[PDB]
Design a protein around this nucleic acid. Structure first.
Lengths: 116, 147, 46, 46, 115, 144
RNA sequence: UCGGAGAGAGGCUCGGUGAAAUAGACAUGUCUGUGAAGAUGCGGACUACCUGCACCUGGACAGAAAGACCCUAUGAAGCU
RNA sequence: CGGUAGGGGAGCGUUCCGUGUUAGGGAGAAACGCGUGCGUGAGCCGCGUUGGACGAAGCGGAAGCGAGAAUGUCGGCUUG
RNA sequence: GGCCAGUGAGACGAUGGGGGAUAAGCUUCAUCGUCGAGAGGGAAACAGCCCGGAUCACCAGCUAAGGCCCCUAAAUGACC
RNA sequence: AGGGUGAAAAGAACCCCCAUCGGGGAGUGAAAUAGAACAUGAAACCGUAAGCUCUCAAGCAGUGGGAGGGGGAACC
């Protein structure tokens, strides 16, 4: 029974679910909008918030954390060298989950992420 | 094309009401036949018979149509304030009649068969009935037992 | 065991309704007075 | 595992009706989404 | 010298029509339309002879109640001691018929019988 | 005859199962054109799109062909019927083979605009009987 | 012993395509009794709103192959 | 005047032929139905429709001549 | 005698018996009944027990076998 | 295994929905609810609309009796 377990897991096995979250957050921090099924939206929400706050504190150690999580190299440098101005005193709750019509082909609930 | 529209009546409808009302409900009158009531015997079976009525009976012995008849084997002639009840029959109790067309009552499919035992018989039957009408009742005065 | 049981047909003769009281076997129906005859029932004479 | 005998028209009409009707309930939801998507304050449908 | 037929379609439309309001496959599905047909005719027999028997029963019980209405122990049994002893030519359990239409008349009958 | 209060828009063998097109078509029976429009636009059903294209090609087919509105324009009957079905032999284990059918819908929709002579009161006036026939374009529970 | 938790693929729900064997018609209760002697279809009593979905498989002498065991046929065939 | 196996008697109907390039028939031949019209019955008269071309009756003749039963069989359709 | 059939293992009940264990809804023969080929009422249901024999119609009556408290007709009628 | 629009393609100019699939008008034709998966078109099977009706039920589902109601004003 689920009772108590609160790790949002996707349709995928462990390894591939990791990979999906890392790639998917990378591409969020790259474009700012994104379109994923709602479940992927929630699972993103957690991690991308972690990366943002990880950039709010731009010491080397943390920079190497993020350097290890995100795939694309230079989106990180742009990111932490850019955001502690954007999200100065926003203090948590960085995304926004403006949702949208389903996906012809699955009628799969589909949502559309922001950064604000 | 175009809708029919109003037309051109522009005329206020007649409001007499009463004439239209007379037109709307049809008249009913029904006659009273009389206060008398009999029980006659034809074939073997009996009939509660009241004057002016049809009865589908068996009487196809021989009698052409548009006829006149006395059904003299009468019993229990009863008016609507007294009755006369009699042994087997009440004397002089002519119940006058008008024989008419000798029908063939509707088909009754007699259909018999058993089971696996392989037979069946589609056969029908018209009982030749006679539809008598009753005109009046007579001679029920003697020995009235009504009370 | 050692006693047989009574089956179809055999069961019936043991257990069919019998009117086993000499009296009711005897009886006969009411007769009546002879009921002297009855008239005709039909007449063309009219 | 294998059915004995075909069902009537009666029963089948009952179940097909439950299928379609199960589709009935899931329209008025979409009609609410429509009647709300007609321009109005909302955070959905960019 | 082929000799093919259509006389089935009439043979069979006729039945197809005699089995209407039969509420199932018994009204559509010819190869059972037939045996149904057979079985409706059969129950027409049994329900016909049983209807003669059945209406006697109904009048016996109905006249029986009208007679027991006298509060003393009378019967449909004893009413016929007394209705044949006094010669009444067989009102034919259709005194059971007036017993519900002209009840006063049936009390007249009944009083003349008691005498 | 409906007397031009009807515009049938028959359908091709639109290549989808009859019964699913029947769950949406049963969905849309009676509702006026605007509603069923905005529903079929957003309905999450595959059989909803071709039905949509049909409807809109029935309104538009009833505005310049006849000449009607759309706001007072309902879906009267909107029936589906089966059509030609094709037959494929798809094979399967131990050398058996099974027909896989391939159905086709066949939809006829009968929209219905509104044309009314308009009668002020219930009372009847057994007059203008020849005219009366013209007057009684459409009535419910009529007697006599 | 004596099970338990976990990951994956199915199951489950929603969108799409969409078979199968079986199938007299089935408006298809329990216990007893009966009956070709082990019945939802008959009798008596009890019990049961209508209808879904998931789940298990005791019955419908459930499906499958006109039994392969036994016997018969002045059957067929192989071997001695 | 019950009736299975079975025997005998009397009939209806269908495609075709003789009477015919018949009577009748684009004011309209057959399949569907209203008539419990009619028959003991197989069936027959009438009655209607978008289409619509042929063809009775009577006295006779012939039969690829009458179907729900063959795990028949060809096609179309369902149940699950 | 002619022309032609079907049938060839019946079942139970009553009786007299053999076999069996004076066991079988067993088996085998002799004389009859019903079923077979036969309906209907009594027997709760119930081929082979009882009355009885079905040409049809009847919203007429008298009875047989069996029955008269309710479900179901008919006296919860008499007296020992 | 797969035949039969019409007498003549006169086989559908034009318009609108329009991914040119398929339709509604217009037009032809005596008729195209004869329009090209087109000549009569049965039954199974799939729907639709109207009339009466089923949720304390028990049934090879009919039959005899017929409550209540609807139909053209005694028959269904």
């Amino acid at each position: 029974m689920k009772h108590g377990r609160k790790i949002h897991r996707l349709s995928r096995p462990a390894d591939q679910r990791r990979a999906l979250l890392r790639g998917l957050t990378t591409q969020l921090l790259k474009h700012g909008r994104i379109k994923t099924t709602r479940a992927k939206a929630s699972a993103m929400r957690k991690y991308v918030d972690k990366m943002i706050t990880l950039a709010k504190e731009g010491s080397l150690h943390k920079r190497r954390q993020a350097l290890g999580f995100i795939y694309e190299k230079q989106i990180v440098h742009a990111l932490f060298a850019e955001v502690p101005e954007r999200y100065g005193d926003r203090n948590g709750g960085y995304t926004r989950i403006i949702r949208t019509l389903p996906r012809r082909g699955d009628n799969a609930p589909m949502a559309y992420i922001e950064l604000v | 094309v175009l809708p029919d529209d109003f037309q051109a009546p522009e005329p206020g409808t007649p409001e007499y009401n009463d004439i239209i009302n007379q037109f709307l409900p049809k008249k009913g009158p029904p006659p009273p036949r009389e206060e008398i009531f009999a029980v006659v015997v034809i074939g073997s079976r009996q009939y509660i018979v009241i004057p002016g009525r049809w009865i589908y009976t068996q009487r196809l012995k021989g009698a052409t149509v548009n006829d006149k008849i006395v059904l003299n084997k009468v019993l229990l002639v009863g008016t609507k304030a007294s009755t006369y009840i009699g042994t087997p029959i009440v004397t002089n109790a002519a119940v006058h009649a008008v024989v008419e067309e000798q029908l063939l009552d509707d088909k009754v499919i007699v259909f018999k068969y058993k089971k696996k035992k392989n037979y069946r018989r589609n056969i029908g039957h018209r009982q030749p009935i006679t539809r008598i009408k009753i005109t009046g009742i007579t001679g029920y005065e003697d020995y009235p037992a009504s009370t | 065991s050692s006693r047989p049981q009574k089956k179809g047909t055999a069961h019936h003769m043991k257990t069919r309704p019998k009117k086993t009281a000499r009296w009711d076997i005897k009886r006969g129906p009411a007769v009546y007075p002879p009921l002297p005859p009855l008239p005709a029932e039909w007449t063309i004479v009219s | 595992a294998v059915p004995k005998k075909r069902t009537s028209i009666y029963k089948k009409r009952i179940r097909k009706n439950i299928w379609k009707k199960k589709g009935y309930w899931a329209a008025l939801k979409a009609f609410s989404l429509a009647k709300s998507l007609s321009t109005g304050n909302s955070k959905s449908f960019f | 010298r082929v000799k093919r037929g259509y006389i089935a379609r009439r043979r069979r439309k006729k039945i197809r029509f005699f089995a209407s309001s039969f509420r199932g496959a018994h009204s559509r599905l010819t190869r059972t339309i037939a045996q149904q047909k057979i079985r409706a005719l059969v129950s027409a027999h049994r329900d016909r002879d049983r209807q003669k028997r059945d209406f006697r029963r109904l009048w016996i019980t109905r006249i029986n109640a009208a007679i027991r209405e006298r509060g003393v122990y009378y019967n449909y049994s004893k009413f016929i001691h007394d209705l044949y002893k006094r010669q009444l030519l067989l009102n034919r359990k259709i005194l059971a018929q007036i017993a519900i239409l002209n009840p006063n008349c049936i009390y007249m009958i009944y009083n003349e019988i008691i005498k | 005859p409906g007397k031009c209060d009807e515009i049938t828009t028959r359908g091709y063998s639109i290549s989808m199962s009859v019964d699913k097109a029947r769950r949406v078509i049963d969905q849309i029976r009676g509702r006026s054109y605007a509603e069923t429009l905005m529903i079929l636009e957003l309905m999450p059903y595959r059989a909803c799109y071709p039905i949509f294209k049909l409807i809109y090609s029935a309104a538009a087919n009833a505005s310049h062909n006849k000449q009607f509105n759309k706001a007072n324009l309902i879906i009267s009957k909107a029936e589906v019927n089966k059509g030609i079905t094709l037959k494929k032999v798809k094979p399967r284990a131990r050398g058996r083979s099974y027909m896989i059918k391939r159905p086709t819908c066949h939809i006829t929709i009968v929209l219905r605009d509104i044309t009314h002579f308009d009668s002020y009161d219930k009372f009847l006036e057994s007059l203008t009987p020849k005219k009366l026939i013209a007057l009684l374009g459409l009535m419910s529970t009529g007697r006599r």
